[PDB]
């Protein structure tokens, strides 16, 4: 299946409270594996997945030196952006970035990407061709021009295509027991009464992995997609995920509805009834 290596970077200024807070979080698929926080007592890139213990001390020294470099780089960016937007030095501002690469089952590259945002709004992003940039506004146009003359896309492309890909393959190998496992969901339904002779049927899917799953409610074989409440899949604290979907039905008509659970850890879908 596809696999990805992603890094979420966030730089937040905080006038009057010192230097900006800087954080970097790394993920291999839906699994947090590394993290860096500048507010930490002792800021160092630390492991978040047990399989990362296979990396020598020179790994952590390199990643930490790198992060501290990124931190300074972003402090500058927060100053520059105030200029571009004619803003004051008194407010708090945020820069977010996502960078990554995705590979297929055979380990070849599917795609690479890097996107920036300022104050929760798109700023500049690398195009699919991995050669050109696209700016969301006038300010981003200034950066686009600077980056085109300095030839940044070629350096970045070297990373997304090589380094990112090769290290991703290594992580999947060293941590295959964790990253290549499959936990099957365990489902159940709950009943809650409401006014006007109606009820809320909720179907729960628990402790599964990977995060991708499909939960549907059915009546007469038709998947009731319009009239169905649902929550985004969420982590449950131990590396697995959970999700639920509910439907309000006429009192005493409960048995006419069923819940179907589709997941790669299920040879045949689960069908539940209350």
């Amino acid at each position: 299946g596809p696999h990805s290596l992603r890094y979420f970077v966030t730089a937040v200024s905080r006038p009057g409270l010192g230097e900006p807070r800087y954080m970097e979080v790394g993920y291999v698929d839906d699994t947090e594996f590394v993290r860096f926080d500048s507010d930490a007592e002792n800021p160092r890139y630390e492991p978040r997945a047990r399989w990362m213990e296979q990396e020598g001390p020179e790994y952590w020294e390199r990643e930490t030196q790198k992060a501290k470099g990124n931190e300074q780089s972003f402090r500058v960016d927060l100053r520059t952006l105030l200029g571009y937007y004619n803003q004051s030095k008194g407010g708090s501002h945020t820069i977010q970035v996502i960078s990554g690469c995705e590979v297929g089952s055979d380990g070849r590259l599917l795609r690479g990407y890097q996107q920036y945002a300022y104050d929760g709004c798109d700023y500049i992003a690398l195009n699919e061709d991995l050669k050109t940039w696209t700016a969301a506004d006038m300010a981003a146009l200034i950066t686009k021009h600077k980056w085109e003359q300095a030839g940044e896309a070629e350096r970045l492309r070297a990373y997304l295509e090589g380094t990112c890909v090769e290290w991703l393959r290594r992580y999947l190998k060293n941590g295959n027991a964790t990253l290549l496992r499959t936990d099957s969901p365990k489902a159940h339904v709950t009943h809650h009464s409401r006014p006007e002779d109606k009820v809320t049927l909720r179907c729960w899917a628990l402790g599964f992995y990977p995060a991708d799953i499909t939960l549907t409610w059915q009546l007469n074989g038709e998947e009731l997609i319009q009239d169905m409440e649902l929550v985004e899949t969420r982590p449950a604290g131990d590396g697995t995920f959970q999700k639920w979907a509910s439907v309000v039905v006429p009192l005493g008509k409960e048995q006419y509805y069923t819940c179907h659970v589709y997941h790669q850890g299920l040879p045949e879908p689960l069908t539940l009834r209350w």
Binding site: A67, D77, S99, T143, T163
Partner: peptide
């Protein structure tokens, strides 16, 4: 393996 040399805006 995190990226470095993030170009300045």
């Amino acid at each position: 393996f995190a990226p470095g040399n993030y170009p300045a805006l």
